[PDB]
């Protein structure tokens, strides 16, 4: 079950590939430079992202990291509504 964007509706089903596509989409959405290094900061899947605190996002992306955290939480929240 995928969303409009090609990404599975439940973030917990995200592979590393999905995580990277989500990061690229977030960069485009937020007007951040689309770079190969952004996804390299997140070599993991959705299960791993669930364990990440805001602090761990900011550590990787100080400029924009909170929007990533915020967006992932929203996706996870609605998903848990199962």
């Amino acid at each position: 079950p995928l969303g409009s964007d090609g990404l599975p509706l439940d973030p917990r089903d995200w592979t590393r590939a999905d995580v990277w596509k989500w990061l690229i989409n977030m960069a485009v959405s937020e007007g951040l430079e689309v770079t190969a290094e952004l996804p390299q900061k997140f070599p993991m899947n959705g299960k791993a992202l669930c364990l990440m605190s805001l602090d761990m996002y900011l550590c990787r992306v100080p400029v924009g990291g909170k929007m990533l955290y915020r967006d992932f939480r929203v996706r996870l929240a609605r998903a848990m509504s199962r």
């Binding site: 592979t15 590393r16 070599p43 993991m44 899947n45 299960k47 791993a48 761990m56 550590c59």
Partner: protein
């Protein structure tokens, strides 16, 4: 994770430590891990600082560290 592994990570053998890491690489879809950097028993694995893990697993060391720390908390809770 594997039921063969003892609940308290601090009691893991070297091979238990490797099983845990291999399981983590799969479960979290991490890039190939350099196991030469993790030839140690549970006692020492559990003493690695977040920065230590970071050096041995760039990009996901902090996640692994937190998971391990959580397993310890859990062995008690």
């Amino acid at each position: 994770l594997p039921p063969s592994l003892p609940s308290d990570p601090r009691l893991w053998s070297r091979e238990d430590v490797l099983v845990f890491l291999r399981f983590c690489v799969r479960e979290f879809d991490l890039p190939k891990l350099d196991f030469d950097l993790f030839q140690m028993n549970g006692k020492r694995l559990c003493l690695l600082t977040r920065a230590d893990f970071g050096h041995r697993c760039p990009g996901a060391g902090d996640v692994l560290h937190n998971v391990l720390q959580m397993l310890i908390i859990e062995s008690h809770s």
